[model samples]
Target: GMLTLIQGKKIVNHLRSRLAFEYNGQLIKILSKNIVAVGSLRREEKMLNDVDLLIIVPEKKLLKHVLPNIRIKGLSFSVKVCGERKCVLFIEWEKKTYQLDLFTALAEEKPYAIFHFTGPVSYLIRIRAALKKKNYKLNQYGLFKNQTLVPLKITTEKELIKELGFTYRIPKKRL
Candidate 1:
C-alpha cells in the first residue's frame, strides 16, 4: 500500500508525539519520507519499502517498546526485535515493515550519530565521497581527517552538513 503525502505526514506526526510521550525528552528523527511535507501532503505512488526511523535516546533500552502499536492512524503494524537490537515493525495484515535503527546521543556522539541515522543512501554516499577526496572520512561513529580524528559534537543537522561544506538542507529536502 502506498502512503500518500498526507498519510505519511499523519503517520510521522503521530509517531513523533507518541514516542515523545513514551520516551520523555528524547529525540525522534524521521529516517525517511524526506522530512516534513512542504507544499502538498499527497502520495504520488505506493511505498515499496518499509518506513525508516531513528530514535535517539539516552539509553538503548528504550528501543524495546511496542513500536508497531505506535500505529500510523488507521494502519496496523507489529513490532519485532531483530539482529543487534534493530527493530522491524511488520504491518498487521500487510506485508510492509518499518525498519528502525536506534542509537543514543551520548555527549560525544551527537551530530555524527544523528546524521548517519537520518539518511537516504545516495546523499550519504555523496558526502562520504567528498570527504574521502579531502583526505577525511565520515561515518556513523565520527569524522576523521587523515590519520587523526577530527573532534566534534554536533547538535543539529545544519551544523553537520555545513561542516562537510554543503548547502544547509532541511532533512525533509535531503531526499
Candidate 2:
C-alpha cells in the first residue's frame, strides 16, 4: 500500500526528531536541521511510494565522513546502497518495510540537491531543456557551462528557480 501524505509526514517527523544513535560510546542525535524531506513528500503528493531526504553536511565526502559513524539506535534497517552522494536504506516500521533514500550534499550545494531531488521528472526535463538552450547544465551538484562549474550563491529553492528564469511555484504545483 502507498503512503498517504499524513503517514509520510509522521514518518519524516519520526526520523527528524525522535531518532538517535550511539557512536563511539557517545549518544548522537540526527540533526533535524541538516536533514530535509524531499521528493514526493516535499511536493505534498497524495500518495507516496518512498521517502527521499537530502542531508546537508559540511564535508564533501558523505559515505566517508558522515554515515559510517552513527548507527541507528533501535531501527531494523539495512543499507541497500551506500555511495558518495546517495544512500538507500530499507527500514522496518509497523511490520512493513519502507524504502528511504538519503542524498548527501555539501552546504553550498544544498539548494541544487533539494531542487533536483524534489522534481517530478517532467518538470526537471523542462528545466534542463531550458538550461541547455542557454548553454547551461543543471545537476544535483551545481550548474555547469561548457564543462566548467558556474558558481552561484544559491541558498533557497526559490532562488534557484528565479536564477533559471522561471517563476517560482510551490513544489505541489510543480507537477
Candidate 3:
C-alpha cells in the first residue's frame, strides 16, 4: 500500500503556516532532516524510523510543546528545544517514525541550516509540489549526487569535517 505521504505533508505545512502566522516571523522555514533522509537510508529491510525536523524561526519558543493542539490523521509528532532559541521535533507514524525539527539560527548560520533544510524540508516541499503537478522525476539520490564532488562516498566523508567547520584527527588513513 502506498503511504499517505501527501496527507502527512499537508498536515505539517498547515501546522507550520499556522505557527508562522501566529508568531509573525521574519523567516519561517523548515529545516527538518528525517523528512528526506529517513527512507533513503538502507531500504532493503522494512526499517522503522522517526522523522527529524529543524524548524527555523526568528523568535524564541516558536513551538513550545504545542503539538498536542494539532490533530491530524496518520501523523504523530513531538517537539524538542536545542536551546532557548532553536527547536526540533521527532514524529512517529505507527512503527515508522519521523521528525520535524525547528531552529532559530541567525543570518550568519542560515547557510548551514539552508543546506540541511534544502535536502529535507525545503527540498521535500519542492519535490512534493512537483509531484502534485505530475512533473516529478524519481531520483532518490539525485540531490547528493548532484552536489557531491568526490568520486566515492567514503572519500566524500572528509568533506563533512570541513563543512562542519571543524578539524578532526585522521589516524594516518590506514597506513
Candidate 4:
C-alpha cells in the first residue's frame, strides 16, 4: 500500500534515517553513501506511493554485504527484486506493506543517478528533450556528449542542473 508523506517519513525515519544510528552505521559500513530519498518524496509531494533511495556504492559490494545482511536480519522487510543497479524491498508496518526502492550508482555516476531518479517524469522529459537538442544524452548512468561522457565533478542536484545549463529549481518546483 501507498503512504502519505507523513506516514512514509515516520517509517523511513525509524528504519533508515540518522535517528536510526545503529542501522545507518551498519549501512555505512557496507560502503554505501548518500542514502538520499528520491522520486516523489524528493519532490516534496503530499502523498508518496513508495520511498525511493539513491545510494552510491559498488554494485558487487551492495549485493554481497547488504543483501545478505538484510536477509539474515529478518527485520520486517523482504527483498522483492534484487538487480545489479536497483533493489526493491517491501516493509510491513501496521499491517500495510510499504515499498522501498534502492538504487545504487558508482561514485562517478552518483550525480546523474540522483538527478534522474528524483524526477517527476515530465520534468525529466523536458530536460532530456533540451539536452537532445544540444546533442547530449542523459540517463541514470551519466550524461554524455555525443559518444563520450561529460566528466562530472559536482555532486549535488543543483550543481548538476547548472552544469546542464538549466537554472536551478527546487525539486518541488521542477514541474
RMSD of each: 6.8, 2.2, 15.6, 4.1
Poorest lDDT segment (10 consecutive residues) of candidate 2: 61-70
Clashes of 4: 0
Residues forming the 10-long window of minimal summed lDDT in candidate 1: 34-43
Model 1 residue 47 lDDT? 49
Native-to-model Cα distance after best TM-score fit, residue 136 in candidate 3, in Å: 36
Which pairs of residues collide in model 1? 2-46, 4-43, 5-42, 5-43, 6-41, 34-172, 35-172
For residues 53-134, write the lDDT of model 2, one tens digit per residue: 8877775544464555445656798888786577788888799888988877888878888899999999999989988998
Ranking by TM-score: 2, 4, 1, 3
Candidate 4 residues 1-175, lDDT tens each?
Answer: 6789988777656555331212334544432244677889888899888988766665544444453343313257787888656778887788778888877677677778888998989888999999899898999988888688888788877798898898998888888
Stretch of 10 with least lDDT, candidate 4: 16-25
Best-to-worst lDDT order: 2, 4, 1, 3
Model 4 lDDT on a 0 to 1 scale: 0.72
The number of the candidate with the highest lDDT is 2
Pairs of residues clashing in candidate 4: none
Clashes of each: 7, 0, 14, 0
TM-score of 1: 0.59
Model 3, TM vs. native: 0.31
lDDT of 4 at 134: 83
**1-175: candidate 3 lDDT, tens digit per residue:** 1234453454355554334222243333233321222221212122323222333333335444222222233456555544434345565545654554443433333334433332434544554465446543222222232344222222232354344333532322211
- How far residue 24's Cα lies from its native spot in candidate 1, in Å, is 18
For residue 65, what is the lDDT in candidate 4?
44
The local distance difference test score of model 1 is 0.52
